[PDB]
Amino acid sequence: VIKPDMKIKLRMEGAVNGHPFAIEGVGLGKPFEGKQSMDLKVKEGGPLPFAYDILTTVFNRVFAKYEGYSWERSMNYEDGGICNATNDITLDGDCYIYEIRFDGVNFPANGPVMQKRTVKWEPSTEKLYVRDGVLKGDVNMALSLEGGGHYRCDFKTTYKAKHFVDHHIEIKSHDKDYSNVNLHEHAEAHSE
Numbered sequence: 001v002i003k004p005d006m007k008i009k010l011r012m013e014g015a016v017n018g019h020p021f022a023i024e025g026v027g028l029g030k031p032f033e034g035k036q037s038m039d040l041k042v043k044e045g046g047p048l049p050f051a052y053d054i055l056t057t058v059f060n061r062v063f064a065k066y067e068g069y070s071w072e073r074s075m076n077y078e079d080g081g082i083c084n085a086t087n088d089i090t091l092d093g094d095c096y097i098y099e100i101r102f103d104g105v106n107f108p109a110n111g112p113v114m115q116k117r118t119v120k121w122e123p124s125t126e127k128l129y130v131r132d133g134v135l136k137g138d139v140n141m142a143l144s145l146e147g148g149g150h151y152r153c154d155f156k157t158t159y160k161a162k163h164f165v166d167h168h169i170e171i172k173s174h175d176k177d178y179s180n181v182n183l184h185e186h187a188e189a190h191s192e
């Protein structure tokens, strides 16, 4: 029911520090090869007044090597910024559809997110475990900063269907104000 080549269509509606925006994207990935890529367009609220990197992990764990589901996530940044995100994932033929909501608050004006001083997420390892019959996933994430140094964030995801996973996520290309972004992720699961 999961095919070697699958398409992705997503819409994100969100806000950061009260400023609303929306983004649409199309892409394709290889579930069993643990690869995906996509092109993302800002439809509303552009040009975004915050670092695009806080969105990238929100833009599917089926894309990982060795009815649908949904997930909720909290991303707690070390300087007090909090982001909540959800994704409802459904399957339509050979096409995954993501309905995504994103909401961030309390990012300081002088911090690296609002001043767009972030470069990339360092590769990470998500720890997945079951609790109350649903799957949780925690990870310490870190954004690399332009002036050297790192910006810590704690991720807490709940997966709900209707070991480790190594992640690497890169923005391969973007225009000046990030209205267009090409985004790429690899992911493998392991254990012991």
Ligand SMILES: [Cu+2]
Pocket (backbone or CB within 6 Å): 174
């Ligand atoms: Cu760049």
Ligand SMILES: [Cu+2]
Pocket (backbone or CB within 6 Å): 035, 184, 186
């Ligand atoms: Cu690649």
